[PDB]
Design a protein around this ligand. Sequence first.
Ligand SMILES: CC(=O)C1=CN([C@@H]2O[C@H](COP(=O)(O)OP(=O)(O)OC[C@H]3O[C@@H](n4cnc5c(N)ncnc54)[C@H](O)[C@@H]3O)[C@@H](O)[C@H]2O)C=CC1
Ligand SMILES: CC(=O)C1=CN([C@@H]2O[C@H](COP(=O)(O)OP(=O)(O)OC[C@H]3O[C@@H](n4cnc5c(N)ncnc54)[C@H](O)[C@@H]3O)[C@@H](O)[C@H]2O)C=CC1
Ligand SMILES: CC(=O)C1=CN([C@@H]2O[C@H](COP(=O)(O)OP(=O)(O)OC[C@H]3O[C@@H](n4cnc5c(N)ncnc54)[C@H](O)[C@@H]3O)[C@@H](O)[C@H]2O)C=CC1
Ligand SMILES: CC(=O)C1=CN([C@@H]2O[C@H](COP(=O)(O)OP(=O)(O)OC[C@H]3O[C@@H](n4cnc5c(N)ncnc54)[C@H](O)[C@@H]3O)[C@@H](O)[C@H]2O)C=CC1
Lengths: 315, 315, 315, 315
Amino acid sequence: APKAKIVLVGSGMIGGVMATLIVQKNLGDVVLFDIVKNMPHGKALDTSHTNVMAYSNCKVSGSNTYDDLAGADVVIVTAGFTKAPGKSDKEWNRDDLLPLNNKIMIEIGGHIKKNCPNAFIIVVTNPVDVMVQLLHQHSGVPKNKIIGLGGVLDTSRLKYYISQKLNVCPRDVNAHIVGAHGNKMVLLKRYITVGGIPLQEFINNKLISDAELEAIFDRTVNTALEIVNLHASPYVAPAAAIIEMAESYLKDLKKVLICSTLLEGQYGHSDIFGGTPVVLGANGVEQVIELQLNSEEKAKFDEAIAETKRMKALA
Amino acid sequence: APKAKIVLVGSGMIGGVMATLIVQKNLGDVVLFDIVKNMPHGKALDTSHTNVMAYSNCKVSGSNTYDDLAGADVVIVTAGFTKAPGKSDKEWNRDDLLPLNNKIMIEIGGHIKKNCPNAFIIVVTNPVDVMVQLLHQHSGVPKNKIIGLGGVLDTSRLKYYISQKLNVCPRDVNAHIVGAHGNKMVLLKRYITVGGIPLQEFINNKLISDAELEAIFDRTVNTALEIVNLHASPYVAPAAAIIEMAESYLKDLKKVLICSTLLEGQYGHSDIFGGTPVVLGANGVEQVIELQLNSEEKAKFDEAIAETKRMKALA
Amino acid sequence: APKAKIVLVGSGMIGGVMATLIVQKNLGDVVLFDIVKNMPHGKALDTSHTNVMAYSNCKVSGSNTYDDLAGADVVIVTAGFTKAPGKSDKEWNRDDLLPLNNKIMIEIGGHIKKNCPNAFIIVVTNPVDVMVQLLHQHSGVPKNKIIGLGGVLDTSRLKYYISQKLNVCPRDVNAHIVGAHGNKMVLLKRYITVGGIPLQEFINNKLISDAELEAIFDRTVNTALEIVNLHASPYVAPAAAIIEMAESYLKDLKKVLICSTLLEGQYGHSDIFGGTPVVLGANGVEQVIELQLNSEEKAKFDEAIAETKRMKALA
Amino acid sequence: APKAKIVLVGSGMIGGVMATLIVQKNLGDVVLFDIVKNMPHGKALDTSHTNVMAYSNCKVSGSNTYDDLAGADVVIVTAGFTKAPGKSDKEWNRDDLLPLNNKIMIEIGGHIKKNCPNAFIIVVTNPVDVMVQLLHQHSGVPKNKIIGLGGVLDTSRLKYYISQKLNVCPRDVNAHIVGAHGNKMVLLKRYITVGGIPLQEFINNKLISDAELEAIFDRTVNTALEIVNLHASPYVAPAAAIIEMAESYLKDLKKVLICSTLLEGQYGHSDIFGGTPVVLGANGVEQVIELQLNSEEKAKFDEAIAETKRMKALA
Ligand SMILES: CC(=O)C1=CN([C@@H]2O[C@H](COP(=O)(O)OP(=O)(O)OC[C@H]3O[C@@H](n4cnc5c(N)ncnc54)[C@H](O)[C@@H]3O)[C@@H](O)[C@H]2O)C=CC1
Ligand SMILES: CC(=O)C1=CN([C@@H]2O[C@H](COP(=O)(O)OP(=O)(O)OC[C@H]3O[C@@H](n4cnc5c(N)ncnc54)[C@H](O)[C@@H]3O)[C@@H](O)[C@H]2O)C=CC1
Ligand SMILES: CC(=O)C1=CN([C@@H]2O[C@H](COP(=O)(O)OP(=O)(O)OC[C@H]3O[C@@H](n4cnc5c(N)ncnc54)[C@H](O)[C@@H]3O)[C@@H](O)[C@H]2O)C=CC1
Ligand SMILES: CC(=O)C1=CN([C@@H]2O[C@H](COP(=O)(O)OP(=O)(O)OC[C@H]3O[C@@H](n4cnc5c(N)ncnc54)[C@H](O)[C@@H]3O)[C@@H](O)[C@H]2O)C=CC1
């Protein structure tokens, strides 16, 4: 059939929500692939029944076979560790799973290259800005055909928190977080708008203060940790962000979405992936948009890239 | 505000998917209530960010306080045990959590009666046909304002499996499973249609055989066990079924949906809840539809009710 | 791009609503083609702005050039007369526009054959069961790639009227009207269900009477005339019905929808198009479903086909 | 029932599309009211059938009786002249229908005050910034409960035209047009963004030039005339814009939408309605946002208000 085939490489928490949302949106047939025996078949079976409630007709199947990547139109990679086995929830960060998640990207890359070299790839495995580049290199796909999750998720938090303070529709807040996903994420105060209006106007009117915004910025950076400390794990919003990206590709929406993409001189950087607004449509990354950062913003961008490089070296 | 307030009493697996779907559908503000400290706040935080991706404006908050039921328009109860601590996955059934889940329904009932006596209640805790009646009795709500999950979920499986064999849109298969949710569920072959056409026509044409249907019937009854044996748990389709019910109420859709409701003479039964098609709209259960069962079908219905009564006695 | 290209051959009342709905549903790029100069460009411009309100990205362009059919994935033909210039609204029927609408189908057929022989075609021009066959013959497309509007529209009326009486969700009423679209349409009482339940059960319960149903049947047959006599014209529901058909094709939904299709022995008929349930998916008409009519129902079906043949002869 | 009751006062071109969209979105029951006998009943009948195709349950009825405004939750006023009977399509403007459309607003105002004084009112009749104030005065409704269409429609055009040039999703372009709807509309270049980024960045990169933007500005102002000169009439996008506003109210979305609202000192203006961003939620106009215009922008705003006052005097 002409329905898209969407292979979820990793059928864990994010994978499950993604499968649910794909059926809700009737986006395409879904394969829940994992190394864990049986589990993806079980999740697939459960999820498949929702076609009735959703008025959809998407197949949902499980797989324990890498070759099921054959024919994939979109591949979403969440496979990997989510935390270092030994580290507390308080100290959740990035040094030693690097080589293990690198091996996972290498393995998946080989299977993509053999089975679905023309697929559009979204990488989620952390640290994403490192893992996406590794997968790019080992899968051999074109630069316009692979991106990493980051900015859509990170800005959803910033947008949401501001919308709550200002009592406006969440989507009406727009904002940019660039460079990398992680603690070095660059929050661009200058690029925040509310209903298309510069946030500064709302600050001038005392509707939201600079101090409030500083607290919202810190909350945004630390949201994953906040959720973990509350005895939960972030997987629902990550899934929705990924599906927004995938849907833009599948439907040729040409949305402007901030994702990790190969930089070729933007911001003074080459040979590395970093977060920046891109346009996602039928041709994949159709445009890479370079924000005209000032020197102070660029300094923060540089710090983010430096951290990606540091971890890439250890991987 | 006039947005509906939807309180999820139980913030586990089903609760999480329900919160996700409510935001996707912009159905109302959500409270994830649970006895587990912090966890519902974490899930709520994660889920709240999806308002951006979904173009919605639903608050999602966590709660560890029963009094947050105040003002509820809809209350969905998934609180309870999901399996007997000690029993293998192979032997997943119903005798001894009864008194513990009864205590949970009693407790929740008291809080509903005090805080939101005019709410519409959907009960999910198993065995649902027993627990719904217990909650009805202790909450004091009118009979048209409380239902149990069952038939929407069980028929989604039957509909889906037949649709796959016949290669038609899942929603185009209609089917009735009545009496109770559980191993005594009554699958009504006579009441199956495909695009509104009697299934028997498709059997006559050899498009699906009676033997195939028998296997699909057994698969439907055993689906929960099938999913558990695959190292997964059924929670996505249960959530979608519940949201279909809740949405029909909230939007006054007047959908015909099979749910557990107080029987007042239908099928020869009174003073018990059992699964039957009902019409759900703004006034709750607006109609209870009694299928004109033959004697053989009625005998099976009686077996289902007898099992509900047996467990009610032990609760 | 991979977005579908949908060419509306005829940019009148139905064409306008179809363009509106396609953008609402983000189904594909739209060409509003017509012989009237400028008008389609104006409607296209107006409609294109709705992409903003709809969160969609579908191009909407006008055309006065037949060659713009090139590349079409779906072609919807509403081109033609809607009433005989000279006949009152009271006497709205079918004898003398036949040769003129035949010429229009022939002309469009030639352009389809040259420019988009692989497109999926939906014919709407009346009398549709005649015009669809004429277009099939002159376009040269395969039988699984061309259908006529009829049953989805006619049953929407029957379903709706019954749903109002019974106070249930309109989609929960299912019904079959076959043979032809027009005054000889065959309404199959035996094949009506409500929430999947035989309508007869509701009659037995005195919820709706046989006399009420007879009146609803006559109302259904005469609905177009009822609307015309109220100083309006039926175009909104026809458009929605057509878009339901087109969407099933585009999204590979495999819905069971009653449409005019080439009969190859079904109901005892060959070499003619008539209304029957079909399954619409990615391969076009994937299945032609033959209802197992009794002799009385078949007699009415024969009357419908005879009328199609009578008018085909005059065309 | 608790479904909203939406009364369309005026059942012409815009009214018809609004009814269609309300059913598509299942927003509430609809009354198509008009002074033309029978016509609204015909349009209502046609539109009602779409509930089946749309999976909705909204009543659609026609009315020739002002008292059917009773119980209205939302009233949308499109009643009036659309062009001066005698003036060519080339010379489409605003001097002498003023007293006639004023009489229509006065009449409707009296009926609103008597029958639905708590309804939320959207005025569309041109010149809208004048007519909305007239209706406000004669209906007696609070200032937070009545708005005029303008900016959502006018900016949809600007947003769309820019999105086409830049090859991005239309909704990703944000823009502000304020003061009044009509030839004095104030297009604010400084307040245009693309994916939340200042448009100036795209100009700097030569992706769109200042000269291109000037042409798009003129096209935006003249779009209604462009459509009329193409032998069409703008009614589809106006309807969608109105429904976006109505939906924000009904669903408590709190969208920021530019509408005509009573100014109470903003921009230096009082005692007049003018276009400005507002937040629409359950409480109606929840916030009036005042853009921090520079002196040059304010001068243009003043010109717009002066024109509204000039016509108000003649009404
Ligand atoms: C970039 C970003 O914004 C975020 C990234 N993540 C990363 O996303 C990944 C997945 O998170 P999830 O919560 O889904 O973790 P999980 O443990 O539930 O699922 C991971 C699955 O991967 C499987 N897996 C391991 N190796 C695999 C392989 N070779 N192939 C397929 N699946 C594999 C494994 O069995 C598990 O089910 C982790 O690396 C997270 O750090 C998470 C949240 C946000
Ligand atoms: C009727 C039907 O078709 C189905 C019913 N169920 C029942 O639904 C219930 C919930 O299933 P879920 O998978 O969500 O289980 P879970 O363990 O993840 O969540 C249950 C939550 O209830 C909480 N809980 C316990 N007591 C509570 C109380 N007094 N108040 C609120 N929450 C409570 C508990 O902490 C956990 O998070 C179980 O009884 C299932 O048997 C499940 C699938 C289908
Ligand atoms: C099968 C069915 O359920 C229905 C069928 N119809 C038929 O659908 C047709 C279109 O109805 P609509 O209300 O859209 O009529 P319209 O007059 O507004 O539009 C017809 C357009 O066709 C154009 N047209 C004429 N010749 C054409 C050609 N060769 N190519 C393209 N357009 C052409 C013509 O200029 C007008 O704009 C008529 O034949 C109706 O009888 C209508 C309602 C229901
Ligand atoms: C503010 C704005 O962006 C726009 C405003 N308009 C205005 O919207 C109005 C309606 O436009 P439409 O295209 O719908 O015009 P129409 O002639 O098809 O419908 C007007 C209907 O009003 C009826 N009408 C007249 N007096 C009435 C009354 N007292 N009560 C109810 N209906 C009445 C009349 O019979 C016709 O059906 C006109 O004033 C337009 O100028 C239009 C497009 C954009």
